[PDB]
Write a protein that binds this ligand. Structure first.
Ligand SMILES: [Mg+2]
Ligand SMILES: [Mg+2]
Ligand SMILES: [Mg+2]
Ligand SMILES: [Mg+2]
Ligand SMILES: [Mg+2]
Ligand SMILES: [Mg+2]
Ligand SMILES: [Mg+2]
Ligand SMILES: [Mg+2]
Ligand SMILES: [Mg+2]
Ligand SMILES: [Mg+2]
Ligand SMILES: [Mg+2]
Ligand SMILES: [Mg+2]
Ligand SMILES: [Mg+2]
Ligand SMILES: [Mg+2]
Ligand SMILES: [Mg+2]
Ligand SMILES: [Mg+2]
Ligand SMILES: [Mg+2]
Ligand SMILES: [Mg+2]
Ligand SMILES: [Mg+2]
Ligand SMILES: [Mg+2]
Ligand SMILES: [Mg+2]
Ligand SMILES: [Mg+2]
Ligand SMILES: [Mg+2]
Ligand SMILES: [Mg+2]
Ligand SMILES: [Mg+2]
Ligand SMILES: [Mg+2]
Ligand SMILES: [Mg+2]
Ligand SMILES: [Mg+2]
Ligand SMILES: [Mg+2]
Ligand SMILES: [Mg+2]
Ligand SMILES: [Mg+2]
Ligand SMILES: [Mg+2]
Ligand SMILES: [Mg+2]
Ligand SMILES: [Mg+2]
Ligand SMILES: [Mg+2]
Ligand SMILES: [Mg+2]
Ligand SMILES: [Mg+2]
Ligand SMILES: [Mg+2]
Ligand SMILES: [Mg+2]
Ligand SMILES: [Mg+2]
Ligand SMILES: [Mg+2]
Ligand SMILES: [Mg+2]
Ligand SMILES: [Mg+2]
Ligand SMILES: [Mg+2]
Ligand SMILES: [Mg+2]
Ligand SMILES: [Mg+2]
Ligand SMILES: [Mg+2]
Ligand SMILES: [Mg+2]
Ligand SMILES: [Mg+2]
Ligand SMILES: [Mg+2]
Ligand SMILES: [Mg+2]
Ligand SMILES: [Mg+2]
Ligand SMILES: [Mg+2]
Ligand SMILES: [Mg+2]
Ligand SMILES: [Mg+2]
Ligand SMILES: [Mg+2]
Ligand SMILES: [Mg+2]
Ligand SMILES: [Mg+2]
Ligand SMILES: [Mg+2]
Ligand SMILES: [Mg+2]
Ligand SMILES: [Mg+2]
Ligand SMILES: [Mg+2]
Ligand SMILES: [Mg+2]
Ligand SMILES: [Mg+2]
Ligand SMILES: [Mg+2]
Ligand SMILES: [Mg+2]
Ligand SMILES: [Mg+2]
Ligand SMILES: [Mg+2]
Ligand SMILES: [Mg+2]
Lengths: 172, 191, 197, 106, 137
RNA sequence: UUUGCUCCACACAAUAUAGAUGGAUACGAAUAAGGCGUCCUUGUGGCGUCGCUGAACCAUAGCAGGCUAGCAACGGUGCACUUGGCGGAAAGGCCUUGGGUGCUUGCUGGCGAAUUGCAAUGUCAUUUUGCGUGGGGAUAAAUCAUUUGUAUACGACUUAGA
RNA sequence: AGAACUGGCGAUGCGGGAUGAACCGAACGUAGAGUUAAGGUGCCGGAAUACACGCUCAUCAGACACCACAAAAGGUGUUAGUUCAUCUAGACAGCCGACCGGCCGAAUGAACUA
RNA sequence: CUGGGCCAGCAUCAGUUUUGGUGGCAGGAUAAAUCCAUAGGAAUGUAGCUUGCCUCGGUAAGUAUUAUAGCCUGUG
């Protein structure tokens, strides 16, 4: 929950004399390190099957790099989150060059406008938007148009000397 | 959500000049010349040709974008007024006491005078705003047309007159006495 | 660096100009602020007005004469914000405030002196566009500052003489670069640019 | 010539302190041109001198000098800590100090 | 006149093939080009000739230059490096006062003490010529 | 009424310093815009150019900056006068003439420096005040006591007296 | 007002909470140097007017545990989100000859959540 | 002129420490990417081509999958 990584985390119930070879289960977990991701895993699995971490074991944990990290993508993001008075589901769209960068900006948005801290957010699904025109949210659509050019008016240049000898300009 | 570009256009009819620098708009036309100071809005004017100007707002919010269109409307009315011009008409409506309206001047002033309103002995006086002209009508009873190239000056100068007789202390539903704006229109291109 | 720094108050932001001036003094920098009436405050005139009236509200009940003193002029409206950021009830702070001067308009010694600007206190650089901001002198006059027009009247007059001064100054820098022509192509020229001048 | 200065200009800002308690045994110094602790590492170890005047004479002169060395770096803005043989008078806050070029590792 | 004049402040645009100067980074000081847009802040830059990798940069750490060159949206590093040099952006850049000044100061800050000396000996000589030829016409 | 008074000159001893050490280096205005060069029916005008920091500009070499001989400049700069203007926001400063004189590293020569011994030591600034000398200029009041009542608890107030 | 368990105050300074018996941090011979805790780093005031994404304009905005209060109920302020209905079998606004048609060419209507 | 005592600088070390530059290694999808090769595909559809434009400068429609721009996806 700092600067984000994706992990394939594979774990299983402990084997018993009754049942050797219990089924492996995999989750993709967005976390800041392996200790959180491993812990994050058991959090959801205890929300799904009957397992504790005490009763189970983790088979593998592996980082997942973006396959096309310099390729701009449009992402669908499905989020469940508790709010102050209730817990609800959301679809958001994020345009970025990886899933990590997109989850990185996902949690900020859920913090900024919904006041939702990490602990109160589940990421249900994050997938790439296959085509354009399947893009729903309009704040992404603006940057999908053909031959897209815009200015950046009112340039403010950080100074260094604390006194400056001319009236500055913003002209860019 | 901060839209990245939104713009509107301003029709510039044949034989009208529009000079806009440092967001100070000048509009020269057949009727005269009008200016406006738009410095109080961030907006960007582009002149596409002598008949067309665009007003753009880059990466605007909902409230910023709202100011865009009204810039266009403000320049537009500046244009239509320097060409067609504006004409505002009013009607004295009085149930008993005739509302006595004239034009009077004090030290090169020219105020509109209002006498006998609702039986008053007081004399109401509204200054005639600069550049707006007052003429009473021959063929309609109780008219006093107000006309000029600025909607804003003609409309207010009308409403200065309209308000100065408001019937205080009586039921307004019953006492409808006053001078109300009957018709809004143009000087030329009919009316 | 420099013995004294003249700051043009115009188009700056009160609290941020105060903050940078205070440290200067505490660090030994002599300062003078000019055109304090063209200084700005964030927030629209009504707000920063009402804000003043709260300040105006407070006075020592039994004697208004010992109560908080409400100074109207912009330079003083500024000095309060500054003196509030200096520890002024001690000897150090007293000394530091002695290093500061503030004037509305720009009076004779400083009128011919070079004036600087403090970018992080500057309004246009700092405030987001569309945010409303008050002009100090106009607010200062609404609370009873009596000198606004005179300051403006003399400011307009000064701006004339400064214009003409600049007219001569520029025309000379013309005649300096005019006669600089032949040396711009000279051999000592190429000599100098080789080393960067 | 017209300028004889072999030192970098400086300023005595404060003692080392927490919010409510100071430590005269160390002084914080602002150096001209030094905006980052990167830059201030160059002046680490250098000799500083506070120069002041008096009434009585030492040898033929009413001028005296307090000596100290730049010790470590202070914060992100290029301030420097320093320690003088005797602590600086604390009236000295906001007074010029002189940071020399020796000992030199250039 | 009746020409209906309007002053439209002309901005450097975020667009594809805007060449752009990195302020902060290991890539700082280098030029680079905008391959694609992400949002109002992030863009996708490739610096191939100057050494700048392909990457998402915030528009803050970059300063738009006046220079543009034709580039298709999303071009991979290879074709960026082609149309770049095919457009001679590096050659246009260095011809600018902007570029030329960044060089000029670097030279100055590279000067040694003896070179600092020589500059004054030359400047005094250039000073004599000028102050004499000022007092001409 | 013992020594007075003030101004100027450069002269010794005291006196204090919120802190000299190349230089505080003057348009106005705008920032969703401007600066400068240029052009001219002088304009909300045309063309060109710049920004992206003063990382500038000016200054800067010579025993703390000595001695001496020249070349090329007709310039640069200091100081002591001199002619005019402009400056009232706290103008007490700014521009200017005129000569005189000192230096000049723009350039070419001839001499000196040490041992202050491997850093501690260093240029003397800048405020008040007292002795002094050299000339310039000026020659009062006020309080007390008395006195008035337009004043007054006492002071204070307000009048009057060569 | 009165019990349980532990930790404390009392009997204890120190750093933090401006202020403070009990909170946070840490408990104390005399000292030097280093590093930190809790808490902070515009200025008072030691420490980035640091970097980053958003939100917020309040005619008492807000600003950090204990802590020095505010509730139900409203808001066509603005922000994100949900649901249902309509829409390329071309709707919804708009101009053109209730309803229909031509042009347009991608959204629209309502109820909601925080 | 030399003693001892003191104070200071530098060097060579010792203990605590702080802040740079730099070399060589190991793991991972034996990083993922660029890059290269191979198969395919699409559109925020590049070159062409019919359509009417044409002040033949513009041409927006229909086609049109690399052509006179490129991109995406698989494999290696
Ligand atoms: Mg790990
Ligand atoms: Mg189950
Ligand atoms: Mg789902
Ligand atoms: Mg619920
Ligand atoms: Mg969906
Ligand atoms: Mg969003
Ligand atoms: Mg939950
Ligand atoms: Mg800067
Ligand atoms: Mg500057
Ligand atoms: Mg300035
Ligand atoms: Mg009006
Ligand atoms: Mg009644
Ligand atoms: Mg009533
Ligand atoms: Mg206030
Ligand atoms: Mg006090
Ligand atoms: Mg003053
Ligand atoms: Mg008063
Ligand atoms: Mg009052
Ligand atoms: Mg000590
Ligand atoms: Mg001690
Ligand atoms: Mg040592
Ligand atoms: Mg001692
Ligand atoms: Mg000691
Ligand atoms: Mg964004
Ligand atoms: Mg005497
Ligand atoms: Mg004293
Ligand atoms: Mg002009
Ligand atoms: Mg220009
Ligand atoms: Mg300059
Ligand atoms: Mg000579
Ligand atoms: Mg001469
Ligand atoms: Mg001379
Ligand atoms: Mg002279
Ligand atoms: Mg003064
Ligand atoms: Mg004078
Ligand atoms: Mg005088
Ligand atoms: Mg002369
Ligand atoms: Mg009596
Ligand atoms: Mg009496
Ligand atoms: Mg009496
Ligand atoms: Mg109890
Ligand atoms: Mg219990
Ligand atoms: Mg406890
Ligand atoms: Mg105890
Ligand atoms: Mg305790
Ligand atoms: Mg305490
Ligand atoms: Mg508290
Ligand atoms: Mg405490
Ligand atoms: Mg606890
Ligand atoms: Mg304070
Ligand atoms: Mg600080
Ligand atoms: Mg906190
Ligand atoms: Mg509270
Ligand atoms: Mg209470
Ligand atoms: Mg509330
Ligand atoms: Mg509520
Ligand atoms: Mg709401
Ligand atoms: Mg509603
Ligand atoms: Mg809504
Ligand atoms: Mg649909
Ligand atoms: Mg609509
Ligand atoms: Mg809807
Ligand atoms: Mg060691
Ligand atoms: Mg490898
Ligand atoms: Mg091949
Ligand atoms: Mg085609
Ligand atoms: Mg091919
Ligand atoms: Mg493409
Ligand atoms: Mg591969």
């Amino acid at each position: 929950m700092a600067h984000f990584k994706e992990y394939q985390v594979i774990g299983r119930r402990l084997p018993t004399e009754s049942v050797p070879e219990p089924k492996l289960f995999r989750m993709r977990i967005f976390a800041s390190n392996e200790v959180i991701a491993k812990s994050r895993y058991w959090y959801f699995l205890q929300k799904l099957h009957k397992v504790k971490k005490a009763s189970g074991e983790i088979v593998s944990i592996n980082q997942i790099n973006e396959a096309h990290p310099t390729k701009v993508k449009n992402f669908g993001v499905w989020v469940r989150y508790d709010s102050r008075s209730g817990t609800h589901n959301m679809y958001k769209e994020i345009r970025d060059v990886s899933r990590v960068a997109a989850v990185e900006t996902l949690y900020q948005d859920m913090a900024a406008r919904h006041r939702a801290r990490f602990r109160s957010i589940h990421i249900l699904k994050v997938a790439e938007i296959e085509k354009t025109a399947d893009v729903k949210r309009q704040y992404v659509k603006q940057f999908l148009t053909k031959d897209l050019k815009f200015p950046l008016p009112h340039r403010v240049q950080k100074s260094t000397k604390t006194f400056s000898y001319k009236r500055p300009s913003t002209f860019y | 959500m901060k839209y990245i570009q939104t713009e509107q256009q301003i029709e510039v009819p044949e034989g009208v000049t529009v000079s806009i620098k440092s967001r100070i708009v000048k509009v020269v036309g057949p009727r005269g010349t009008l200016t406006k100071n738009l410095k109080h809005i961030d907006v960007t004017f582009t002149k596409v040709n002598n008949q067309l100007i665009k007003v753009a707002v880059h990466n605007g919010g909902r409230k910023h974008v709202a100011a865009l269109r009204t810039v266009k409307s403000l320049v537009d009315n500046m244009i239509t007024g320097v060409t067609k011009g504006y004409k505002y008409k009013m009607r004295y409506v009085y149930a008993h006491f005739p509302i006595n309206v004239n034009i009077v001047e004090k030290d090169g002033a020219k105020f509109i005078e209002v006498r006998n309103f609702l039986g008053d002995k007081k004399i109401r006086n509204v200054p005639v705003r600069d550049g707006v002209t007052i003429e009473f009508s021959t063929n309609v009873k109780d008219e006093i047309v107000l006309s000029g190239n600025s909607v804003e000056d003609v409309s207010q100068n009308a409403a200065d007159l309209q308000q100065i007789c408001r019937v205080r202390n009586k039921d307004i539903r019953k006492f409808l006495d006053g001078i109300y704006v009957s018709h809004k229109g143009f000087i030329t291109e009919d009316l | 660096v420099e013995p004294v720094v003249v700051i043009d108050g115009k188009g700056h932001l009160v609290g941020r100009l105060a903050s940078v001036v205070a440290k200067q003094l505490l660090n030994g920098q002599k300062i003078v602020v000019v055109r304090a009436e063209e200084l700005n405050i964030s927030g629209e005139f009504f707000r920063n007005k009402l804000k003043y009236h709260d300040f105006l509200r407070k006075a020592t009940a039994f004697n208004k004469t010992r109560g908080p003193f409400h100074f109207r002029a912009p330079s003083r409206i500024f000095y309060k914000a500054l003196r509030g950021m200096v520890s002024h009830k001690t000897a150090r702070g007293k000394a530091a405030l002695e290093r500061l001067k503030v004037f509305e308009g720009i009076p004779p010694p400083y009128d011919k002196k070079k004036r600087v600007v403090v970018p992080q206190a500057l309004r246009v650089l700092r405030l987001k566009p569309g945010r409303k901001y008050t002009t100090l002198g106009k607010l200062s006059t609404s609370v009873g500052w009596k000198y606004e027009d005179v300051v403006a009247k003399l400011e307009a007059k000064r701006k004339v003489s400064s214009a003409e001064y600049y007219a001569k100054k520029r025309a000379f820098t013309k005649k300096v670069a005019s006669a600089n022509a032949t040396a711009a192509e000279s051999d000592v020229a190429k000599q100098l640019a080789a080393l960067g001048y | 010539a017209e300028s004889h200065r072999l030192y970098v200009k400086g300023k005595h800002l404060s003692y080392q302190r927490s919010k409510r308690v100071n430590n005269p045994n160390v002084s914080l110094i602002k150096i001209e041109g030094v905006a980052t602790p990167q830059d201030a590492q160059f002046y680490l170890g250098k000799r500083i001198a506070y120069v002041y005047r008096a009434s009585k004479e030492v040898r033929g002169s009413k001028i005296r000098v307090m000596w100290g060395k730049v010790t470590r770096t202070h914060g992100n803005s290029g301030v420097v800590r320093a320690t003088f043989r005797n602590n600086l008078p604390a009236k000295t806050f906001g007074a010029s100090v002189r940071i020399f070029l020796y000992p030199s590792n250039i | 006149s009746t020409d209906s004049i309007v002053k439209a402040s002309n901005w450097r645009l975020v667009e594809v093939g805007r060449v752009v100067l990195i302020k902060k980074g290991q890539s700082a000081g280098k030029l680079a080009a905008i391959v694609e847009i992400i949002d109002q802040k992030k863009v996708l830059i490739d610096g191939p000739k100057a050494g700048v990798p392909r990457q998402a940069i915030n528009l803050g750490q970059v300063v738009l230059t006046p220079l543009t060159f034709a580039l298709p949206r999303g071009a991979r590093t290879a074709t960026v490096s082609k149309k770049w040099a095919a457009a001679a952006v590096c050659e246009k850049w260095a011809a600018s006062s902007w570029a030329k000044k960044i060089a000029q100061r670097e030279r100055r800050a590279a000067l040694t003490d003896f070179e600092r000396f020589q500059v004054m000996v030359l400047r005094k000589q250039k000073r004599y010529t000028v102050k004499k030829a000022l007092a001409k016409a």
